Design a protein around this ligand. Sequence first.
Ligand code: TX4
Ligand code: TX4
Ligand code: MG
Ligand code: MG
Lengths: 214, 215
Amino acid sequence: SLPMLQVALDNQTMDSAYETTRLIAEEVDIIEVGTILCVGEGVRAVRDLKALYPHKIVLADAKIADAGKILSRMCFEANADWVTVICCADINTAKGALDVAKEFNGDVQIELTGYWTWEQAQQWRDAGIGQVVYARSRDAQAAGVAWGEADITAIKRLSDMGFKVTVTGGLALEDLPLFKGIPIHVFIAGRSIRDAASPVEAARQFKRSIAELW
Amino acid sequence: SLPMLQVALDNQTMDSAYETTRLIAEEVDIIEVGTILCVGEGVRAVRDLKALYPHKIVLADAKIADAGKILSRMCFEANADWVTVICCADINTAKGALDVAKEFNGDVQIELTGYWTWEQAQQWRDAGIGQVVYARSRDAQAAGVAWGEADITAIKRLSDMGFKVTVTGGLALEDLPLFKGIPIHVFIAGRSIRDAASPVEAARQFKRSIAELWG
Ligand SMILES: O=P(O)(O)OC[C@H](O)[C@@H](O)C(O)NO
Ligand SMILES: O=P(O)(O)OC[C@H](O)[C@@H](O)C(O)NO
Ligand SMILES: [Mg+2]
Ligand SMILES: [Mg+2]
């Protein structure tokens, strides 16, 4: 399988998000309700986006930290396909969210941003979690933290544990060759698509490069 | 000084939250916009609740995990006084949220969960963070995790490091004596107030017990 392409709608309001979706919804595989849009608009953003694009996978990037069953159910009742749980959530939070995902035939991803451990990685695996998002923090990036070999070896290690790995966090087109040879499940782009002079070209170039590399 | 009482509005809609606030707004110190309510309604929950109760401290329990400046600014533009940042956030995320908080004369709390370390705690202090929320996860609680010895020791050590400590996570009235003798800044009660037969009397019982235990 080729890595899928996900657009992150890190917008504060629906109308701002639609400025992007009206250009590129058909140019990507997955539409993400970004955490910024989850907090700006609430779960209506999931419901509205899935009604607009029912044939796309909709990911609610809620970064659930507790109340796994409650928050997941809210997102799944709004018709999310997938939801995120932040890495430092209690293991029972992740388990809870996953139990609810299964009722809706959806899925849970653990968002790996900031501090987490390899022991937690094993715990998620034993809990039946099959997806992680290897996600360089926007704020770490802004402080000058680049992608590096340690990221590549961590991603390969996660893949080898049986996770379908998503790669994200200020990704630019030119970053993609860093990950060649790894069976990446999804690459996410937010800013590099939404804020490009031509969002359509930016999305197609991502897809082109992925097809060439994989 | 008496521990203050915070009500957690973990409601999915505003009207459900108001069924509680109309009863207990004046019976508590801090009004928390629960994570559940932030995700249910979005940041308008902060704006609306502050407009109803402008004289109270309003906490947006956003549990910010990244994009500290952006999310914190959304909450503070909605007139929040305090915001939460989840403890595994990159340190620059915590710093970013605090930078924006100071611009609004507000504050940030680090919300404790997972496998945080004492060196990370020192980082938060060094970054200028003065509040932490020592929380038992709802889901841990449902799996049978109880308050106990290790919690008391950790809370005391956080206080000695200079943090004001909030304690929370399925607190019932009978849990308060466990923390006697520790200078707790805030106790949060969500379910134990919202779901009581009489929310007003539940809140007052918490206040009476605190006044006795810390008096
Ligand atoms: O490509 P970006 O602008 O960094 O956005 C994608 C990223 O995954 C964000 O949505 C995010 O969740 N950051 O924490
Ligand atoms: O007393 P509760 O129903 O547990 O609610 C308070 C708690 O702090 C929640 O608001 C929360 O943030 N749980 O993670
Ligand atoms: Mg995101
Ligand atoms: Mg809360």
